[PDB]
């Protein structure tokens, strides 16, 4: 049977369940919003094709570029006008295997400078 | 059977004759019977002197007994009524002549009656204690707190015994006055009233003693009930606080997650 | 039923009025054979036959005398014999010598109690042969004395109803207080069990709440 | 001074201790987490491929150089500017 003198055992279990709820309910947070705050980069639709990804740089969102993911990644439209030499070198980064981040480093540098 | 005592031993006969002579001298046998007693007479007694000692010792055991002039014929029946354990070793013909060679059998009986007379006085004194003790311990035994229900019922039986004794003493004294042609049992009633007063004083002490135990139980039970009720309020408040804390945490997570989903959808 | 038997007003009235005769040598009116047994049947004792007292046996008279002592004097013959020969702690007595005097002193104690009781009622000559060698004529005188003490007791028991009733009132007060003490403890003991049951229900409900919630989380 | 009905007060607390309400609330929280994972896996897979990995259990940011093999860690505290965080992780890889 349960006696009132044994309330400390239920009190101890209540403290454990009280701390387990607070610890579990504070794990996930938000990862995409944190990525957009740290990298200052947003992934949005391309306004021309819903499957076209648009990369937006800066808080003012004046500079943006768009690429296609299907097949070989071909560079799309961009708000800052890019010379054909700058556009060919950006696709040349994607021509090599490399990585998508290497293309974004060159893209952010050219779009912000062309602003 | 036969007497286990060494009745024929000369050293044992000198010891029992000394015990007989001392008891007869200490209890004034020579003054009451007008017959001198001596240690020399106890070794070589006479038939007339033996009857005087036997009648004197038995009269102290059974005072109302009526002795016939033929005392020899009654000694065997008296010993049988007295439950003498050595009646088989004594012949009925030896009673008429106790001064012969079988005197040691009768000398051992005289010492047996001397020991019985002394042991009877001590046994009757212990009976007087038992018939008095039930009114002697008074409140000392009864005022103590009862341990079980049987001791409380035993306490009531002692009170009923006290009242019953008082009534019997009134009936005894009133009849004795009635036998003396009086028909005025006033002094017997006054003794009953004085005895009944002490019984009321003893009961009143147990009533006051029990009234204190009743009040001590009330205060102790109120303290026990207060602590129990305090523990109940504590369980109720701790449970309510624990319920609100978990419910508030669930509402916070639902609102924080609901905004995160809205942020993932609005950013388009 | 002690001291309650003595409380009568018109409950019994089974005994005739107490009579005394200044004529005969004994102050008691010597009852005959028939009038002596009409009480002892209505009176609390028990009789085998009216002829059994006309020829009194040794064993029946000791039984009848023991019941008379246990009724009029209010003492137990067996309890007094146990207290008369209580085991004494003195180192002088011998157990082998004690076995001899145990039977002799037990019969002598019964004699002194019967001799004292008959002395108060008006018989100063009580022998040891009055029990172990009963006589037809001598028993009639002894039994005629105890019945006159019984008629006299019934007339005097009306004057004692005051004391008996006041004893019941005082005894009832103590029993009432002790019943309240047991009632107060029983009521509180029930009060605790009812609360302990509800708390035990709450412990099971709270523990079930954590166990079900612990399954969906973690 | 005391409780008028301590037995009934304990019964009221038990009858008001709702279990299904909080269990249903735990279902909605678990459902909201499943919605967040599904709607953010596409972006998180693109962010993770950039070379930046988030470790929210240690409040740190993981930036790994695939050629050097060494990993840089950015711990967060309530004294760092947002421009400091964005300039260190970028142009580093
Ligand atoms: Ni507590």
Numbering used by the authors:
A (entry chain D): 1 to 115
B (entry chain A): 113 to 318, 621 to 682
C (entry chain B): 151 to 171, 1002 to 1153, 1407 to 1451
D (entry chain C): 6 to 98
Task: Quote the study on this structure.
Ndc80c, a heterotetramer of Ndc80, Nuf2, Spc24, and Spc25, is a 600 Å long rod, largely two-chain coiled-coil, with an Ndc80/Nuf2 globular “head” at one end and an Spc24/Spc25 globular knob at the other. The Mps1 and Aurora B kinases regulate and monitor kinetochore attachment to spindle microtubules during cell division, ultimately ensuring accurate chromosome segregation. The Ndc80c head is thus a communication hub for ensuring a robust linkage between centromere and spindle and for integrating the SAC with tension sensing and error correction.
We applied the strategy we used to determine the Dam1-Ndc80c interaction, by generating chimeras with the C-terminus of the Mps1 peptide joined to the N-terminus of Nuf2 as a continuous polypeptide chain. The Mps1: Ndc80cdwarf chimera crystallized in space group C2221 (a = 72.5 Å, b = 168.5 Å, c = 229.6 Å). The N-terminal seven residues of the motif (RRSKRFL) form a short helix, which has a set of contacts with conserved glutamate residues in αH of Ndc80 and with conserved features of Nuf2. The conserved phenylalanine, Mps1 F156, inserts into a hydrophobic pocket lined by Ndc80 L169, L170 and F172, and Nuf2 M154, with a further contribution from Mps1 L157. The C-terminal six residues of the Mps1 motif (LGPAKR) extend across Nuf2 αG, with contacts from residues 128 and 130–132 (conserved in point-centromere yeast). N128, conserved not only in yeasts but also in metazoans, anchors the end of the motif with hydrogen bonds between its side-chain amide and the main-chain amide and carbonyl of K169 (the penultimate residue in the motif), thus mimicking the hydrogen bonds in an antiparallel β-sheet. This interaction positions the invariant arginine of the motif to salt bridge with Ndc80 D295, likewise conserved in both metazoans and yeast.
